[PDB]
């Protein structure tokens, strides 16, 4: 499973890229809105200068015509820009139009397999099921990844799954075992993944033995 | 799984096509008869003008020779016309005869795997098992999809499954997971598939954060 | 699984009772509201005169103190009145208070196992998971029945499960297999459960052979 | 699984009873066409003896059932799976009369019948098999429902066509299987039983 | 799974062929002997005139040398003649000799997987396990199909399985699901496979709705 | 699973009984013929073994089988009458059961036969593992089927796994729920053996002895 | 599964108790240390005045003899006091000593099944496996619940499992399904368990229909 | 699963008992041999401290002599359990001792056939050897699963002692698979108490408590 | 599953190689405790991967050490500990075409990070996990499933092998390689029925 970082903070992105592990970035309106005094499109230019993989940027309008125009504009920023579109009927129309223009798309706010399959059949490059948000209301988000992977595999769809709303390390292992192509997560989750107490003990012992 | 719309209403078909999601259409004698003031063959011309994928049109006669002549007539309307034939002995004769002339066929009113295998071995391009009608008399329609998929896979048949008599969103996910190539459904079902309360809530939150 | 009828219509209730199959009744504010010229309390009197089993009547206030007073008033009507309480924090308060007074409760609008368990632990006599409403937003309602039955069995809870939002005959067979104690359904579903085409054919053949 | 015999032919019933295996009998309007007979049968057989009503109207079914019940304690009234049938089953049950609901082809019907008070339910294996639905799977469903819910309703596997139905019905938990006498005799046979008897006798005789 | 008809009756064979479903024919000495006043070799000539697929014709001698001569004689009748050999030691010798000549063989009277594998390893084009005859002596005939499929798949054998002694529709679906390449059955079974009460009802409702 | 010894040899039976492991004995016409009077042999055996001792009738006619079984039953109270799986055998079993005489229905090769025998009143049914194995049908699976049937339906009928050829039949019969396994003495002795047992005895002894 | 609240905050505990769902309380040294200006023992008196169920209070010393003395003192405060003992060798000695004196114990900081079994065999009333902390270092905490339940059931142990380090709603349903006797969780998690968007929507619709 | 300690060492047995966890003791001829004290005197000391089953092994391989040795051992204390090797003479000794009301533990068991024979001779315990099977490429834990299934299905009250326990993984698996008892060295018992998050948890608790 | 010998003892390595079975060698700083001369000797004898561990914990220094190690022979594989700096080093070394083996891996999250940094090999520790009550063999199963599903060419080295049961299970679960002491390798050859069979064959053959 590939690692994307789920943030609009440029320093966090640089740190993740420097780890040697970074395949992509996801931003959303809330993540962008929490960053102080910088232009959205200028920020995207900075991110795409650093990260060569997919960089998701979300449209603001809810109207298909306006989403399509926003998407064409976003796509001009850099070749690796992916246009994030919400799961709505108008969103499906925008995904189809953008796909016809050769512009990559990522349909977000996906909470079930029916939504994922619609998005895939509209032409989506990526679909983004939300794990944590489902978990919190008593439905297993990880089970959605399994469903979507089984559907895409059986039917020969090239659509790629981004596991989103990742809260903790248990989501990461399970998303990978269940076949999510990509997991997008906060920087703090990425750092948690490096750690184990026996790694800490092993390093100390190796070095103690080495140094007389 | 591909989305077909199960209707003869032209307005509904145009709406479905505008979603960017439509791979085909199925009509049947009941669906056609409920529409007012237009010729069956003229309606088919309008539909095939809009939809590039398979469009099913059902024969009226129960006699093989008449079914074949009806099918040859229907095939002249457009290249994407698929001839719907009922699962009977005469039907199997019609399917073989039409297949010998290069005409695509969809065998309908299938309720078990023996019927589906017969239709496939007669040359059927598609088979249409009925989910809801089976569910209502206490047999699991979705289990039929599983049986036919396994038979076609093991034996190397290129026959395509159209899950028909789709009544609700739970039929759609399950049919896709079980390997139905196509699902044909009312427009109302298609619109239902786009919706989830957390999608609504997510849009609202993204927009509130974006706007100061 | 026991059969409850999910209606406030007295004629429907009398008909279901006359089948010889009826173990109880569920009403709710929507079902009561659609019924014409009769008092809620008068209607409950008539229903409890006909049906000896549990009869659910729902409170209207969302404040615990007021719910408790409504529940006390409802309980005076007949010994088989069960007080229906919506799944909220105030609802749990009301369930505990009413349980302490010896009054039976039915916690409604349950959509996950976390809610079902909280309700069970507040003292609920019944819990009512909603099958159809879950199915429609792409989560399997029947799987919730399985979760709740497993929890109640493993932990020795006497809480009873009412499978609600039953839409069709496939919900009935599955809820029964999965261990719902009770299924509440519209009268029309109950009638559909009696029917099978080989029953019709068997009756006709037995009579043809018997009559010369 | 108990063995019932599915016939109205008295010679076959006596023959089956003589094997030491017979736990009851089922008749039906088709088997009959080809009250005194019921008296004869219930003198020979101690277990449940099913006799089917003729009317399709609840009130008339109930009267017929009351009359049938006077013949012997082990008379079981066979009622078809209809709405009127359910009414009849409840009335008869309230009078302490045993019932067997027939023409059952799914688990919804079996459950309704059980909840109306039926002593027995009779799912039809072969008739389902022939239209492409697995009759044996219906046994599995009904057994699971009855066990989970603590129902004392008994399953009679009916429309048994062959020995494979018998083993599977038993494995899946049918309380009873009803079958023609022919099927019962076929169950006794195996080529290695024949060969083993011959070899035992050859060795024994020098 | 392919449909073969298991008969030596020429009218039945022509009727089966007319359905559009017929991939081949199996005769055997008992099926041939019940047909009146026509020679065995003349009957085979009539059958192979009608049916283009494999037509099985069984040898009478039990001695390998005589089987091989009978088989060379049968092979001259038509290119689609397949030589039926009983499962015996001398049978295996005959299968190997005929296979070396390029003549197709079908080993019959198979009741276990040891026999099926021996036949396959001698060169047999087809093996014919007998379902019904096993069922009657208390062994599951369908399980033998599962064993032979599993063995042939794992080991890369091109040997084909003909499910024989088919008695009813339940044998057909199960043999197909379990991987029998071919099922050979009586014509009466083939007709039964077309039938379902909801197909009948569906045809009636379509016509009712179509005719005002 | 209980151990029965499947032999008519009195010396073998005494040796099996001395091991501390013997719950019963099965004889049959072939085992008896290979060896003294039959009924005198049965007296000797039932003097040594307190558990069930199976003795097979010779006639194939039910009335005659019943008379033979009544005579056999007088020999000792632990005598069990072995009846072959035929239609007359079922008649014989029901009659003998009504008279309180224990029975063991033999030459069982499928679950339909075993269920018939059980419903006729059989104390024991004897499926034949090895003979089924050799014609390509898994004998052990028959044990699994009969155990499931008897368990689900509350039958007290006991299963004797017969035609046991080797140690592998023994472990599997026990895991699958045969109440009893009847086997030759040579099989019983093979069951005691393992190379790591031999090795462990040597090692325990060497360490104990300085 | 029973609900315990995992906090030393008296206001939070009172609020939880008011829901009608509270079966006990767990405190620990970190949880008590974060509460300002009240003594440990006075706080325990306040808690045990409100809560009738098990209230866990953790010893401070790591020496067995001192743990035993601290436990004896703690148990005098109220009959429902349960002495929390860390999983160490000295801890096991304290557990057995306290068990012999009829004092209830809860062995904490359990991270594997070997520790849980040792604790159980020393006489522990409760064991507390830590879900979240295991999850964070890449080991499935919920699988530990499954192992300990299996061991306790197979071997007839009356030891009770408290699922601890509960982070979110997905831990609660899974711990219940897997057989944890008790879950102890922060107040914020308990309130999240009450909520679902279809519960919200259902309340609105009921009231709309009820009010004309 | 109950904990037994697999040692003849008196100091180790006392330490184990002091943990509050000890349900019994197994000695064997190799374990006793590695200790300057009389064997029967040691058994008295052990059984004075430990109430549960204490296993002591016979030396002779001859049935008659095993029986005489067992009767002598049984007089030492009520909780003495006579350890007998899995052999034909062993089965004879188990049946004879069982008839006298004396407890037995059949040792050197490496398959389910041996375990069943021993159970049917009247054995109180059977001791399958995990580690020794593992080392020759056969899964010792699977033997526990087999023996437990057999005893459960057939209503046998025979108890399983998982022996040749080498490491903590044997302990959790033997317990999951239904071994009534596991016998192990004291070192293994102390290893079972340890986990790095337990260490870290303690440190954090005390850090927060002390300002 | 390929056999590697987990030792820095040159005598043990030559014996293992002489068995006909050896696909590689792992050293580590404990096992090792002139290093580079020994590595030259080992890589002359063994054609397959030979793992040598870096000493520094700082990324820049690990990279320089790795570049130096790589000059010794084509089959040198640089062993790097699972830390943030280690991931940086793995990516740099991978970009230079140098093979890497990430060690001290105890969960599937670590294994996946390592794979995505470019690691040639990842080394999960079986015995060390087993001892703290977590099933080391289940980690092999997880990593194999992740690598297969996602098309990763990363190879698994099952490390901290303690006994023959670890070997069979590691192979069944899909570990590409198992590294173990020579003692364990010789133990794998043995079975009492092999001993008995040889004796019986020879007795029959000699009259």
Please list the residues that pair with D101 across neighbouring strands: D79, D121
Q: A136, A144, A191: best mutation site toward chain G, by most G Cβ within 10 Å?
A: A136
Residue B60 CA to residue E207 CA, distance in Å, equals 8
Report the distance separating Cα D39 and Cα D75, nearest Å: 9
CA angle C88, C92, C93 (to 5 degrees): 115
Give me H2's structure tokens. Answer: 């109950």
Q: How many residues does chain F have?
A: 210
Q: Least CA distance to G113: which residue of chain H?
A: H172
Measured between CB atoms, which of C112, C137, C138 is closest to A138? Answer: C112
Nearest CA-CA partner of A177 in D189, I148, C51, E138:
I148
Instruction: Please state, in angstroms and rounded to a whole number, the distance separating the CA atoms of residues H164 and H147.
Output: 16
Tokens 């009579």 correspond to what residue? C207
Secondary structure tally for chain D: helices H, strands E? 11, 8
Rounded Cα distance between F10 and E32, Å, is 58
Among A33, A9, A53, which residue's Cα sits nearest to residue A162?
A53
Sign of CA dihedral E198, E200, E201, E203: positive
Taking residue I43's Cβ as centre, other Cβ atoms within 10 Å add up to 19
Domain hosting residue C25, numbered range: 1-212
Helix (H, G, I), strand (E, B) or coil at C23: strand
Q: List the structure tokens of C13.
A: 């209730």
C-alpha to C-alpha distance for C161 and F38, rounded to whole angstroms:
67
In D63-72, which positions are buried (b, 16+ CB within 10 angstroms) versus exposed (e)? ebbeebbebe
Tokens of H172: 């959790």
> Taking a C-beta distance cutoff of 8 angstroms, is the pair F26, F4 a contact?
yes
Backbone φ, ψ for residue H167 (5° rounding): -165, 170
Residue E52 CA to chain centroid, in angstroms? 15
Q: Are B142 and B174 in contact (CB under 8 A)?
A: yes
DSSP letter assigned to residue H129: B
How far from the centroid of its chain's Cα atoms is residue B42's Cα? 20
* Residue E155 burial (C-beta neighbours within 10 Å; 0-12, 13-18, 19+): exposed
Give the span between the Cα atoms of H79 and H71, in whole angstroms. Answer: 13
Q: Per this entry, what is the length of chain H?
A: 211
Question: What distance in Å separates the CA atoms of residue H61 and residue H65, rounded to the nearest whole number?
Answer: 8
Cβ distance G173 to C28 less than 8 Å, yes or no, reads: no
CA dist A196 and F41 (Å) reads: 74
Can you tell me the distance from the alpha carbon of C143 to that of C164, in angstroms, rounded to the nearest whole number?
A: 13
Q: Given the DSSP bridges, would you call strands F124-127 and E182-185 parallel, antiparallel or unpaired?
A: unpaired
The DSSP bridge pattern shows strands B2-6 and F2-6 to be unpaired
CA of G164: how far to CAs of A25, C193, G2, H121, in Å? 35, 46, 12, 47
Partner-chain contact F30 D199, CB within 8 Å:
yes
Are F90 and F118 spatial neighbours (Cβ–Cβ below 8 Å)?
no
Dihedral class, residue C78 (left if φ above 0, else alpha if ψ from -120 to 50, else beta): beta
Q: Of G158, G156, G150, whose CA–CA distance to G179 is shortest? A: G150
Which chains contact I through at least 3 pairs of Cβ atoms less than 8 Å apart?
A: A, F, G, H
Does the beta-carbon distance from A191 to I84 stay under 8 Å?
A: yes
Phi-psi region of C102 (alpha: psi -120 to 50; beta: other; left: phi over 0): left
The torsion angle over the Cα atoms of residues C104, C110, C114 and C120, rounded to 10 degrees, is 10
CA A31, A37, A39, A45 torsion-angle sign: negative
Taking each continuous run of H as one helix and of E as one strand, the counts in chain H are 11, 8
Q: How far apart are CA F104 and CA F89, in angstroms?
A: 10
Measure the CA angle with vertex B154, ends B151 and B158; round to 5°.
75
The number of CA neighbours under 13 Å toward the Cβ of H104 is 32
Cα→Cα distances C133→A90, G198, G202, Å: 24, 8, 10
Tokens standing for residue D97: 């009369």
Contacts of I88 (CB under 8 A, 6+ apart): A18, A19, A20, I59, I63, I117
Q: Find how far residue A108's CA is from the centre of its chain.
A: 9
Specify the residue for token string 């399997």. Answer: C140
Q: Which two three-digit tokens encode residue I53?
A: 């561990």
| Residues on chain E bordering chain D, Cβ-to-Cβ distance under 8 angstroms | 135-138, 140-141, 167-170, 173, 192-193, 195-197
Residues of B with CB under 8 A from a CB of A: 1-3, 18-21, 23, 169, 172-173, 176-177, 179, 181, 191, 193-194, 196, 198-199, 202-203, 205-207, 209-210
CB-CB under 8 Å, B19 with A114: no
Yes or no: say if H63 and H92 are a contact pair by the CB < 8 Å rule. yes
Tell which residues of chain B come right before a gap with C–N over 2.5 A: none
Which pair of tokens denotes residue I139? Answer: 């980690």
Tell me the DSSP string of chain B. Answer: -EEEEE---HHHHHHHHHTT-EEEEE--HHHHHTS-SS-HHHHHHHHHHH--S-EEEE---SSHHHHHHHHHHHHTT-TTEEEEEESSHHHHHHHHHHHHTT--EEEEEE-SHHHHHHHHHHT-SEEEEBHHHHHHTTS-HHHHHHHHHHHHHHHT--PEEEEBS--SHHHHHHHHHTT-SEEEE-HHHHHHHT--HHHHHHHHHHHHHH--
Q: How far is CA F192 from the centre of its chain?
A: 20
The angstrom resolution of this structure is 1.9
Residue I38 CA to residue I69 CA, distance in Å, equals 12
Contact B112 D106 (CB under 8 A): no
F9: Cα within 13 Å, side-chain hemisphere: 12
Interatomic CA distance for residues D199 and F84, integer angstroms: 12
Residue D124 DSSP one-character state: B
Residue recorded with tokens 């609900």: G3
DSSP code string of G90-125: HHHHHHHHHHHTT--EEEEEE-SHHHHHHHHHHT-S
Which residue does chain F place closest to I194, by CA atoms? Answer: F195
Instruction: Look at phi and psi of residue B192 and say left if phi exceeds 0, alpha if psi is from -120 to 50, else beta.
Output: alpha
**Percent helix / strand / coil, chain C, rounded to 5:** 50, 20, 30
Paired residues of I50 in beta bridges: I25, I76
Q: Which residue in F3, F32, F10, F1 sits closest to F187, CA to CA? A: F3
> Can you state the angle between helices G113-122 and G89-100, rounded to 10 degrees?
30
Burial class (CB in 10 A: 0-12, 13-18, 19+), A192: middle
Say if CB H207 and CB G30 are below 8 A apart: no
Which chains sit next to D, with 3 or more Cβ pairs under 8 A?
Answer: B, C, E, F
Question: How far from each other are the two terminal CA atoms of chain I, in whole angstroms?
Answer: 42
Q: CA of I196: which chain F residue's CA is closest?
A: F195
Which DSSP state fits H17? Answer: H
First-to-last alpha carbon distance for chain B, in angstroms, is: 42
> Residue G106 and residue H190: Cα distance in Å, rounded?
20
Tokens standing for D146? 């009855």
The single-letter DSSP state of residue E159 is P
At I207 the three-state DSSP class reads coil
- In A, which residues are within 8 Å of B207 by CB distance? 29, 60
Nearest in space to D23 (alpha carbons), one of D8, D52, D1: D1
C-alpha I49/C-alpha F144 separation (Å) is 51
Task: State the distance between the two ends of chain G, measured CA to CA, in whole angstroms.
Answer: 41
> Within chain E, how many helices (H) and strands (E) appear?
11, 8
The answer to whether residues I100 and I80 touch, using CB atoms and an 8 Å cutoff, is yes
Query: Dmax of chain E from CA atoms?
Result: 72
Neighbours of H58 (CB within 10 A): 24
Q: Round to the nearest angstrom and report the end-to-end CA distance of chain C.
A: 42
- Chain I positions touching G137 (Cβ under 8 A) are 106-107
CATH number where A37 lies: 3.20.20.70
Q: Is I77 helix (H, G, I), strand (E, B) or coil?
A: strand
Minimum Cα–Cα distance from F197: chain I residue? I192
Q: Which of B2, B23, B198 sits opposite A133 (nearest CB)?
A: B198
**Chain H environment of G109 (Cβ under 8 Å):** 195, 197-198, 201-202
Half-sphere exposure of H168 (CA within 13 A, CB side): 26
Interstrand relation of F158-161 and G126-129 (parallel, antiparallel or unpaired): unpaired
Give the angle I125-I131-I135 at the CA atoms, nearest 5°.
65
Is the dihedral angle over the CA atoms A29, A33, A34, A38 positive or is it negative? Answer: positive
Look at chain B and report how many structural domains it folds into: 1
Q: Can you say whether the dihedral through the CA atoms of A187, A192, A193, A199 is positive or negative? A: positive
First to last CA, chain A: 41
Give, for H76, the enclosing helix (H) or strand (E): helix H63-76
CA distances to B9, B38, B40, B185, I128 from B46, rounded to whole Å, are 11, 11, 10, 20, 71
DSSP per position, chain A: -EEEEE---HHHHHHHHHTT-EEEEE--HHHHHTS-S--HHHHHHHHHHH--SEEEEE---SSHHHHHHHHHHHHHH-TTEEEEEESSHHHHHHHHHHHHTT--EEEEEE-SHHHHHHHHHHT-SEEEEBHHHHHHTTS-HHHHHHHHHHHHHHHT---EEEEBS--SHHHHHHHHHHT-SEEEE-HHHHHHTT--HHHHHHHHHHHHHH--
Residue of F23, F6, F53, F48 whose CA lies nearest to F162: F6
At G155, give phi and psi (nearest 5°): -100, 5
What value does the CA radius of gyration of chain D take, rounded to a whole number of Å?
18
Report the residue of chain F nearest H148, measured CA to CA. Answer: F175
Cα-to-chain-centroid distance, residue D90: 20
Total count of residues recorded for chain E: 212
Burial code (b: 16+ CB inside 10 Å, e: under 16) for E113-145 equals: bebbbbbbebbbbbbbbbbeebbbbbbbbbbbb
Spatial separation of the C-alpha atoms in residues D50 and D101, rounded to whole Å: 10
Query: Is the separation of the CB atoms in H13 and H46 below 8 Å?
Result: yes
Q: What share of chain G is helix, strand, coil (3-state, %, to 5)?
A: 50, 20, 30
CA dihedral (I180, I181, I183, I186) in degrees, to 10, reads 40
* DSSP run (H or E) holding F104: strand F103-108
Q: What angle do CA I182, I187, I189 make, to 5 degrees?
A: 110
Q: Residue H17, Cα to own-chain centre: how many angstroms?
A: 15
What's phi and psi for G9, nearest 5 deg?
-75, 115
Please give the Cα distance from F48 to E28 (Å, whole number). 59
Cα separation, H67 vs H91, whole angstroms: 11
The H or E element that residue G26 is part of is strand G22-26
Cα gap I100→I119, rounded to integer Å = 5
Is A63 catalytic? The answer is no
d(CA E43, CA E7): 12
Q: Which chains touch H (3 or more CB pairs under 8 A)?
A: A, F, G, I
Coil, strand or helix: which one is D54? coil
Sequential DSSP letters for C94-145: HHHHHHHTT--EEEEEE-SHHHHHHHHHHT-SEEEEBHHHHHHTTS-HHHHH
C-alpha separations of G11 from D123, G6, G40, H129 in Å: 61, 13, 15, 56
Q: Which of I107, I165, I167, I193 to mutate to test the interface with H (most CBs of H within 10 A)?
A: I165
Q: What is the greatest pairwise CA distance in chain H?
A: 72
- DSSP-derived letter for residue F110 is S
Neighbours of H78 (CB within 10 A): 10
């Amino acid at each position: 499973m590939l690692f994307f970082v789920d943030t609009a903070n440029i320093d966090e992105i640089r740190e993740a890229n420097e780890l040697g592990i970074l395949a992509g970035v996801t931003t959303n309106p809330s993540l962008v809105a929490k960053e102080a005094n910088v232009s959205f499109h200028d920020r995207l230019r900075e991110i795409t200068d650093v990260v060569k993989g997919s960089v998701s940027a979300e449209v603001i309008s809810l109207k298909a015509e306006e989403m399509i125009e926003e998407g064409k504009e976003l796509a001009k920023i850099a070749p690796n820009i992916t246009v994030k579109i919400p799961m709505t009927s108008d969103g499906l129309k925008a995904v189809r139009a953008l796909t016809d223009l050769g512009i990559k798309t990522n349909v977000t706010l996906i909470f079930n397999a029916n939504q994922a399959l619609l998005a895939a059949r509209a032409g989506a490059t990526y679909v983004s099921p939300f794990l944590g948000r489902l978990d919190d209301i008593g439905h297993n988000g990880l089970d959605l990844i399994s469903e979507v992977k089984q559907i895409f595999d059986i039917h020969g769809l090239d659509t790629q799954i981004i596991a989103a709303s990742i809260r903790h390390p248990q989501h990461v292992t399970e998303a990978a075992l269940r076949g999510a192509h990509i997991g997008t997560m906060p920087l703090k989750v990425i750092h948690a993944l490096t750690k184990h107490p026996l790694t800490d003990k092993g390093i100390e012992q190796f070095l103690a033995d080495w140094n007389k």
